[PDB]
């Protein structure tokens, strides 16, 4: 039984859920950011699509209740399912997080602001010009399609992480 919450209907006509099926979705006529507010708890009514969350490695968080036990019915019963709050991966679970609002456009989240990433790290942005790539990087971030991607490694808390990073060059 899967446990992923999608509540998508673009009142403003974004055409955002038209972007999950590509060969077509590549549109961003208007592209003309990272500083957020610390992660609390969202509940599936505000969510559409997966909820990616950055350890150096990207992870999707599953539906659950007020406690940790999961939901398994596609987030729909006042489903306080995403416990996105944590300190930092040396101590906590992740740095920061991104999911798509049903708005059609979404916002990010991150640890208290201020290599240097494991010190001053919140969202998927390693540096101002570089983010971490996850299967929905183009969807949540449609203005970074022209970034060049490459492989990198990073040691965090004693374990090695292998990442794919996209950058404006």
């Amino acid at each position, epitope marked *: 039984i899967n446990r992923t919450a999608l509540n998508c209907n673009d009142s403003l006509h974004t055409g955002f859920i038209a972007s999950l099926f590509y060969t077509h979705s590549f549109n961003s006529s208007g592209c003309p950011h990272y500083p957020p507010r610390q992660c609390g708890v969202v509940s599936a009514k505000t969510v559409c699509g997966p909820v990616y969350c950055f350890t150096p490695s990207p992870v999707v968080v599953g539906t659950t209740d007020r406690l940790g036990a999961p939901t398994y019915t596609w987030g729909e019963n006042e489903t306080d399912v995403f416990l996105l709050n944590s300190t930092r991966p040396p101590l906590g679970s992740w740095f920061g997080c991104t999911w798509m609002n049903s708005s059609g456009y979404t916002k990010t989240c991150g640890a208290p602001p201020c290599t240097t990433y494991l010190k001053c790290g919140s969202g998927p942005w390693l540096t101002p010009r570089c983010l971490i790539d996850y299967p929905y990087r183009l969807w949540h971030y449609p203005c970074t399609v022209n970034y060049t991607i490459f*492989k990198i490694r990073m040691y965090v808390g004693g374990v090695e992480h292998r990442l*794919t990073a996209a950058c404006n060059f």
Partner: antibody
Amino acid sequence: EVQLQQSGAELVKPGASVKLSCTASGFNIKDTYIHWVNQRPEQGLEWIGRIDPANGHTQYDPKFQGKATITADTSSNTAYLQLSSLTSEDTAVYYCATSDYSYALDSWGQGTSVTVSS
Amino acid sequence: DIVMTQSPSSLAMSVGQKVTMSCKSSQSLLNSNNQKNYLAWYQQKPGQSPKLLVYFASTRESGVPDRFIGSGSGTDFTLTISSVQAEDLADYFCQQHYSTPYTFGGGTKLEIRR
């Protein structure tokens, strides 16, 4: 230093073929390059090729083409090395090593020794 | 193909002393954009798989003791152990990660004098 588990010691008759395994644990293979290095009895090291498992792109040393074909399957987090038409100078140990953009082999596997004899 | 010549082929050192072995390439390994030398040093203890000591000529790999130091530029490279230990016995390989095909050195075998 991520960990990579290789297949077991293989005995191959002269002329036969053999495929070697290299399975990766603790990370997604698509964020690394997967190289294959060779070492013959009391010899140096030799780079055979590499594969980008994110797009399948493979580079090889010219001296090994036709003899070695590198493949990767992100389903099983596993890369392979297929040796075709083996001779006695193919008797060696075959390593698999990860890399980042720098192409420096930062983490290796335990190796797989191949013996080509009748 | 870039040719890597390692000297010497064999090396003996008492414990606690400093030893140096050299690596030379057939063409420059210095990047003009990067100002980085794409040379790597590997240690292969007998009956084991090679381990990454230094990459980018002088950047020591995480977890490696600080007695291993890579130095050089352009075409002349040296690996140095500040004070060799009884465990340091190995075949030390230098490799260029500059251009395809990536070529290896002959290797410098380190013995211990007791």
